[PDB]
Amino acid sequence: MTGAVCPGSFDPVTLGHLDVFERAAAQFDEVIVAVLINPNKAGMFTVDERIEMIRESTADLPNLRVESGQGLLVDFVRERGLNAIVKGLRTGTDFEYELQMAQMNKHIAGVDTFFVATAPAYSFVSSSLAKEVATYGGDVSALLPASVHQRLLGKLR
Amino acid sequence: MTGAVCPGSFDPVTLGHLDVFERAAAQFDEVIVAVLINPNKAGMFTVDERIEMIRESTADLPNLRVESGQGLLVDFVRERGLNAIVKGLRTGTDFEYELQMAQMNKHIAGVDTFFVATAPAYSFVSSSLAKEVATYGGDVSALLPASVHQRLLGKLR
Amino acid sequence: MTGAVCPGSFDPVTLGHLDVFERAAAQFDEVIVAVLINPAGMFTVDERIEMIRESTADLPNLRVESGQGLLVDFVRERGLNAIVKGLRTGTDFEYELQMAQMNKHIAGVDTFFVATAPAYSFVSSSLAKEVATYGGDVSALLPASVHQRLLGKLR
Amino acid sequence: MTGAVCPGSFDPVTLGHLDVFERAAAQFDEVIVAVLINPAGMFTVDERIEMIRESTADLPNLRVESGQGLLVDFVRERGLNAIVKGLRTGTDFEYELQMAQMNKHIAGVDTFFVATAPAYSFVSSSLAKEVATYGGDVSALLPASVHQRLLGKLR
Amino acid sequence: MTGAVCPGSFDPVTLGHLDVFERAAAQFDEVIVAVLINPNKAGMFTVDERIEMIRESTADLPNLRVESGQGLLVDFVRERGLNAIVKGLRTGTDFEYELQMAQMNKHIAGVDTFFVATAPAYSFVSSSLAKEVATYGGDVSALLPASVHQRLLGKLR
Amino acid sequence: MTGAVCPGSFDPVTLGHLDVFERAAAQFDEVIVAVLINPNKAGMFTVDERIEMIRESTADLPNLRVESGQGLLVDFVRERGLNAIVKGLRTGTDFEYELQMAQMNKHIAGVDTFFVATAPAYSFVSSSLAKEVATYGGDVSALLPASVHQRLLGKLR
Ligand SMILES: O=C(O)c1ccc2cc(F)ccc2c1
Ligand SMILES: O=C(O)c1ccc2cc(F)ccc2c1
Ligand SMILES: O=C(O)c1ccc2cc(F)ccc2c1
Ligand SMILES: O=C(O)c1ccc2cc(F)ccc2c1
């Protein structure tokens, strides 16, 4: 009955993201991870690579599935008969641009956004910072799922 | 069966609170509003009065119930077979002390906390500020449930 | 002879901006909306000026002008030394705080900040354009004028 | 006939407050400093008024008055509907933001915020009192008047 | 030659504090932990108890010593021939009251303040929240040194 | 032997930077100012010009030296036998992205980061804003070292 969408670009997915997926899957009957693709800028990983990395590290979550999309998040959510977004947060500044988008999304489509505090251990990892650190040789193995780390190193090499 | 607890003192309940209750009730199978009884801090309304005002305001939410409690919030939550809290936010600053408490609550009892931004309309209302304004004759009727406003005028007479 | 300047790119002007214009117009004798030329956006400077002028017709003490370079030069060349800027968050206070203190330092121009009306608090020109581009209804967030004009740019 | 009110407890008035008074006086025709009666602090209301009056002698369009209850009633009973308040951080913006939006809602009174001068940015009445109490030199942070008066309260 | 003071009320010391002590001791020739006592309000622990709990959990830091004081921090620092304070931080809001005091302290005494980000694992523990959680029975054993936890439980009982 | 690295692009160095350098040099036995060379982002001054401007401004700091570098900052730091970074702050917002980077840097290489609030006088100056103001003829001479200001007028002519 109940359900939420967990959106992001997940390029690549991090252990911070996985933490949020797990907590959403524990509290909602179904969870859809929404991999948002910009048709005008390729990330590091193709859509199929992003989805596979997420599937491989969520195999123990039976009520979670992964789908890509583009355009308005709230269209993705409503077309699936849902009206909740779950998003991970780190700081009060993350709460400002995110609050703006959450209130816009409620205004235009009646979709609710629930924020959850990331786990402390994973709180400083972001996809962008992990990529940037890995590019210049820093060790980010503890911040990313096994499904990701060596594929990341391969892309950089 | 999914479920969440919405905690507060609600002295009195505001439309900001009600907005959070409605969004919780829309997304979880069961919601419990947990009204804090504080042996010391005695506010304007008794616990029974506060429960009654919440029940009037939430009469159209069949999957939401109101109960009072004391002590550790995560004990209240786990005693009812739940492991989620839903709390309303207004600022990035409220994210800071609330983030600390959410991480603590996860650590000591494995209870998740989901934050939701209250509607823009009700974002500057708080129980304490509504009482203060009403005390000096300002009009806060657009910010409180109808029944609450009526009761609040009584306590001031 | 009090007065203030309300700066921005206004591409396009939103109800959030208009709210700030109205409050500045109510508290200062003279208000000048300063439209940045900085080529690059969706609307030309002329179109942006036109849309602001259409939306502020009931504000007799407001006028709209374009400019570039330092805002403080715009302000002082018109005999004024106050800027009025609308806010939303504590984050916006921070980068805006830096510029306000720089502007005070280099030109003695004061900056007054005003909180956005709660209803218009999540709208920005960029977010409104983005949502409208993907078909979301932003008609409640923009002056009637502007909204029809935006639909024109997209179709 | 523009005007604004600058509220506070001013126990005592600091150079940070005076900076804000001067900026408000420069941009509005009429400025009223509103001194909260709320008994409880170090200086009596009369003494606080006196110290502000001493420090603003060169501001012809400023006056000082006491009051209690709702600030918006103070403001509107004097025919005005603007508050000018000085800031320091994004945190202060947040609790002040809540009150500004409430005040707008209940009485239609606008609040304009101004950034503290960098030099006066870490001084507050409470911190100045605390430091002075333990013998720290706060003479650069307070009007000359006030500083001598504070030394008197401590000895 | 070089030295810093690490101040606080440490009532009681937490693992977050210890992390800061260890990092300061690694970067300065000498570190003084300054236990600040309010002569007009007793905390949970007496000054001697606070000092003993800190000494017991800093025994592997040979260049650290612990002293109590009151009044102006900058007097404590300067009377020891030092002019640096090291303080742990958690958030940007912690940076606001702390920035005010750091700039005041530089103004009145020329003392510098260096802030260090707490370790993620210890980021949500504070003395006050640990005491509050422990009072109502929550498990805070992982957030406090061994020198503290059972002494805390004893005070509460 | 204690020591810290003060990183930046310094294009050009400001009095805000200099204030940080002086406080670092006063508290550590050795300070290294690390000037970023970016293969892409070519600013207004060459790396050699930036190093020379910093050296003029820091002529009275005998325990401070200036060097350029590329890639991962923690590699630069550890290659020089150090494990501390000193960075200047202005806001709570700057605490947020910098906090993330400090926790990352500690995690991947065990390098500590110490933050210091710049003097109130120099708290609104930044290299980018100084250049922008100077470009349009505004006077930023009170915000930059004398030599820098002279050089900056040259690049604009
Ligand atoms: O909102 C709160 O802080 C709070 C905390 C603990 C509580 C415990 C209860 F049993 C009931 C309500 C509660 C609210
Ligand atoms: O939006 C701004 O920051 C901005 C900056 C500079 C400006 C200069 C002008 F002449 C006019 C508007 C201006 C707006
Ligand atoms: O400092 C304040 O928030 C404050 C509040 C209410 C006031 C009412 C008055 F009549 C005068 C000053 C006042 C200041
Ligand atoms: O300030 C920075 O972001 C930065 C980062 C990395 C660096 C690496 C170096 F080798 C030298 C300076 C550096 C500055």
**Cα E148 → chain centroid:** 14
Cβ-based burial of E4 (10 A; exposed 0-12, middle 13-18, buried ≥19): buried
To the nearest whole Å, the CA of E74 is away from the closest chain A CA by 31
Chains that touch C (3 or more CB pairs under 8 A): A, B, D, F
Closest CA to A7 of A80, A62, A60: A80
Phi and psi for A16 in degrees, rounded to 5? -65, -45
Annotated binding-site residue? F149: no
Does the annotation count A55 as an active-site position?
no
Annotated binding-site residue? A9: yes
Contacts of A113 (CB under 8 A, 6+ apart): A84, A85, A86, A87, A98, A101, A102, A105, A106, B116, B117
Does the annotation count B147 as an active-site position?
no
What is the full DSSP assignment across F89-142?
E--HHHHHHHHHHHHHHHHHH--EEEEEEPPGGGTT--HHHHHHHHHTT---TT
Cα C18–C22–C24 angle (5° rounding)?
115
Q: Is A112 helix (H, G, I), strand (E, B) or coil?
A: strand
The partner residue sitting opposite A91, judged by closest CB among F71, F96, F107, is F96
- For the Cβ of C124 lying below 6 angstroms from any atom of ligand 2, the answer is no
Q: Does A110 touch chain C (CB under 8 A)?
A: no
The partner residue sitting opposite A121, judged by closest CB among E91, E92, E120, is E120
User: What is the Cα–Cα distance from C102 to C98, expressed in whole angstroms?
Assistant: 6
- For the Cβ of F145 lying below 6 angstroms from any atom of ligand 4, the answer is no
- For the Cβ of C86 lying below 6 angstroms from any atom of ligand 2, the answer is no
**Two tokens at A37?**
């693709």
Looking only at the bridges linking them, the beta strands covering D62-67 and D82-87 are unpaired
**Two tokens at E139?**
């498990």
Q: Which of E127, E147, E149, E151 is catalytic?
A: E127
**Two tokens at B85?**
């809290």
**Two tokens at D46?**
């009369």
A&F contacts, CB < 8 Å? 35
Q: Which of B90, B106, B147, B149 is catalytic?
A: B90
Query: Long-range contact list for C56-61, CB < 8 A, 24+ apart?
Result: C56/C18, C56/C21, C56/C22, C56/C25, C59/C21, C59/C22, C59/C25, C59/C31, C61/C25, C61/C28, C61/C29, C61/C30, C61/C31
Q: Is E19 helix (H, G, I), strand (E, B) or coil?
A: helix
Cβ-based burial of E157 (10 A; exposed 0-12, middle 13-18, buried ≥19): exposed
DSSP C116: P
Looking only at the bridges linking them, the beta strands covering D110-115 and D82-87 are parallel
Question: Ligand 1, atom 13: nearest CA belongs to which residue?
Answer: B36
Does the annotation count F149 as an active-site position?
no
**Cα E92 → chain centroid:** 19
**Two tokens at F69?**
């570098």
Q: What stretches of B18-135 adopt beta strand conformation (E)?
A: 30-36, 64-69, 84-89, 112-117
The continuous run of DSSP H or E covering A116 comes out as strand A112-117
**CA gyration radius for chain B?**
15
Q: Does F126 touch chain D (CB under 8 A)?
A: no
Annotated binding-site residue? A90: yes
Q: What stretches of E9-151 adopt beta strand conformation (E)?
A: 30-36, 64-69, 84-89, 112-117
Annotated binding-site residue? F123: yes
Phi and psi for E112 in degrees, rounded to 5? -90, 150
Contact A66, A55 (CB under 8 A): yes
Helix pair angle (F92-109, A92-109), 10° resolution: 110
- For the Cβ of C71 lying below 6 angstroms from any atom of ligand 2, the answer is yes
Probe ligand 1: pick from B31, B76, B115, max atoms within 8 Å of CB?
B76
Q: Which of F55, F65, F78, F90 is catalytic?
A: F90
**Two tokens at A3?**
């359900």
Closest CA to B72 of C137, E33, E140: E140
Reported residue count of chain A is: 157
Helices (H), B28-91: 47-57, 73-79
Contacts of A100 (CB under 8 A, 6+ apart): C88, C122, C124, C127
- CB atoms A126 and F100 under 8 Å: yes
To the nearest whole Å, the CA of F121 is away from the closest chain D CA by 6
User: What is the Cα–Cα distance from D33 to D49, expressed in whole angstroms?
Assistant: 9
**Cα E86 → chain centroid:** 9
Q: Is E54 helix (H, G, I), strand (E, B) or coil?
A: helix
Q: Does E98 touch chain D (CB under 8 A)?
A: no
Question: Ligand 2, atom 13: nearest CA belongs to which residue?
Answer: C36
Distances (CA, A) of D6 to C111, D41, D46, D120, D127: 16, 19, 17, 17, 20
- For the Cβ of F76 lying below 6 angstroms from any atom of ligand 4, the answer is yes
User: What is the Cα–Cα distance from F54 to F52, expressed in whole angstroms?
Assistant: 5
User: What is the Cα–Cα distance from C145 to C47, expressed in whole angstroms?
Assistant: 11
Residues facing D6 on adjacent strands: D33
The partner residue sitting opposite B138, judged by closest CB among D70, D90, D91, is D70
Question: Ligand 1, atom 12: nearest CA belongs to which residue?
Answer: B36
Cβ-based burial of B66 (10 A; exposed 0-12, middle 13-18, buried ≥19): buried
| Resolution of the experimental model, in Å, one decimal | 1.7
Does the annotation count A23 as an active-site position?
no
Cβ-based burial of B137 (10 A; exposed 0-12, middle 13-18, buried ≥19): exposed
The partner residue sitting opposite C114, judged by closest CB among D23, D91, D110, is D110
User: What is the Cα–Cα distance from C52 to C55, expressed in whole angstroms?
Assistant: 5
- Strands across the sheet with E84-89, in order? E64-69, E30-36, E3-8, E84-89, E112-117, F112-117, F84-89, F3-8, F30-36, F64-69
C&D contacts, CB < 8 Å? 73
Annotated binding-site residue? D16: no
**Two tokens at F97?**
């992205």
